Each structure stands twice: as C-alpha cells, then as structure tokens.
C-alpha cells in the first residue's frame, strides 16, 4: 500500500497491559498530535481472544509487553528492560530509601495480583525467596495503587515505570527494591505478514524512537 | 461475635476499577484505626461466577450497578453519580460549562467500559445524534488522567473518578453538555450473610463512609 501520516485516517489497534496503556499512551498521543493528527488509535488487553489469530488477520497491528506466547510468524523487538521498585508516600512515618529487607518485611503491603502478565510472578517470587509480607490489601490491577499509597502508610512493589508515572501526581517516593528481583523485558511484537507494510512500519519506528533505550 | 480491633479475617469485595480507585483509599484509611489486623482483597464483578461466590461466602460484598443481583440479594443505595466532562486545566480552548458545540468540535478519548453502566455512554451519545472525533479508544479508565494531562483531548467520565484525578493530574471538569442519565451506585450482600456480625459491621462502615443519603 502507501502511507502519509499527515493525511492518513487509518485506525491502528494496539494490544497492551493496563500499565502498558498508562505508560505508552500519553507520550504516544502527545507525539501523534504533531505527526499524524487524523489517524485513530484503539487499545485492548492481550487476553481478549484471540491475539494470534487477530494479529494474523490484521485486526491487531502491534502488541507490547512480555507476551511470551507469540513466537513463530512474529517479529519482535525489545524496547526496554524495567526493574521492580518499592514505592510509598513521601511523608511516610518510617519508610526509607534505600529500604532494608527487614523493614520491608516489617511494614504492611498492597499486592497487585496482576494475573497473566509478567508482574504476577513477584507475589510468588517473594514467597519462594522466603520473604514474609503482611498483605493488608490485595487488588487485581494497578489502577488504585497511587490513590491508596497516598492516603495510607502502605507500601507496594511495582515496576519502575509505574513508579515514575505516579511519583509526582500522588506525592510518592520510591526505593531500590530490598529483594533480589529479576528485570522484565518489554518488547514490541508485530506479525510477519505486515513486516513491510508502510503504516505498520512507521508506527513501529515511532514506538522505537519514543520508548526504546 | 466480631471484634474489629482483634479480628484477622479476610474480606473479599467485588468492584469495578473506578470503584476500586474510589472506595479503597478512604476505606483502608479508616480500617487503619478500626480494624488494623484484618485483610482486604478485591476483584472485578466479571471474574468468576459472582452469585455462586457470594452465596458460598467467597465474596462478602459487591459495589456498583450490578443489575444481575436480584434475588437472594439485599442491596443498599450508597449514592447517585452523574457523568462529567474532563480535560487538562491549561487546555487551549476547553471551557466549563462546556457547550455541546465545542464538545462535538473537540477530540475525545473513549473508555469502552464493557459490562458496566459506563458502557452505554458511547451509544447514548450516538443515538442522540452527537458526533465525536474518537481519537483514542481504551478499554478501561486507568490511562485517562495521564493521557488528558499530556494531550488536548477531552473525556466523558463519572463524577467521582473526576474527583480523584483533578488534583493529581491538574485536570478540570465540566457539567456534561449532553443529557445523560445518572448511575445508581449500590452496596450488595447476600441474604445468607445479612445477620453475620462481621459482614454487617463492614456494611455499616461502607454506609458511614460513602452514603450520602442523609445529606
């Protein structure tokens, strides 16, 4: 086909995690305002069936995150790797940075289940490393984290990006995590069929320009 | 009997993402003094089979619209919330109260919000013949604040959600230019546990904290 961002009115469909939405969308829409102001963007969670078939059909253009299932017929590219960080409200009575493992186990925690994303492991990685945490609140997803941490003496274990997005708006501070946790690798997946498609290419290159390290 | 100051029970609460964002901070803040040894865990209403889970006792309370819960379920109105138009405060052109004209002229973020009272909006507007430049459509509300803060987009969003996001993201709101209905936000619990001291107490706390009935 052909592609002119100035004029293009095409709809792009992006699969991403909720945090992925929170992190990618604002600087992307900000960029798209000056680069392709007439195209449309719609996001969806990866779980919603069926990612392989939909990406193969063209219903979904790109996908971002761990998404380990996509292998054959899929090009991928790593935008960045992110570390886990301990985050809490700045005026916290006792929390300190860098935080000791002892204090970590002593304090009370909010847990994000984060089922079927790479961030679901943490609550188990800590358990298998023999680190007791007082789980005062357990929520499925990350949306309520900032608000909760701001109004309580709770602490949370979140990826560094979620921390940076929330630090200023909710008066939160962070701390290098007291527990040896792995990094998460964040990739950009696109189907091999559309590897040469000008539009898909352009949007890809934009994602790389914006987010890659 | 049930003693909050001593109890170490886990309570399970079914609620939407916005519901989480709104109910959870002032609740945990309150529980810090009243019952500092209990545990709370939340979940979306769609996950699992909610009636069976609530009847079995896996889920204690559920908050929202939830028209599915009719029989064997007692409900209690916590409040009524109205739709509001939100955007960043330093917006080049957006004004409050916002004119319907300007609303149709500006660009929008849509939250699909499937299986919610909030899902209807995108349709209610269409059937009222109101065109919108849907620049970005997202499934849920999590990315809204950040997006609005960084772009000249505007969004149709529930009153309380707006209240949560105004201060952190430097957002202003506006009475919605379109005639939209109010959503009724209720507290549901199963009839089996209507007399259960713990469940009763937690209900009473939810009423004390969030009910606007008397005033």
Numbering used by the authors:
A (entry chain B): 88 to 300
B (entry chain A): 89 to 303
Sentences from the paper on this structure:
configuration formed by the association of two symmetry-related dimers. apo-DntR above, the conformations of their IBCs to be very similar. suggested, acting as mimics of bound salicylate.
of transcription factors found in prokaryotes. N-terminal winged Helix Turn Helix (wHTH) DNA Binding Domain (DBD). two Rossmann fold-like sub domains (RD1, RD2). conformational changes which modify LTTR DNA binding sites promoter region DNA.
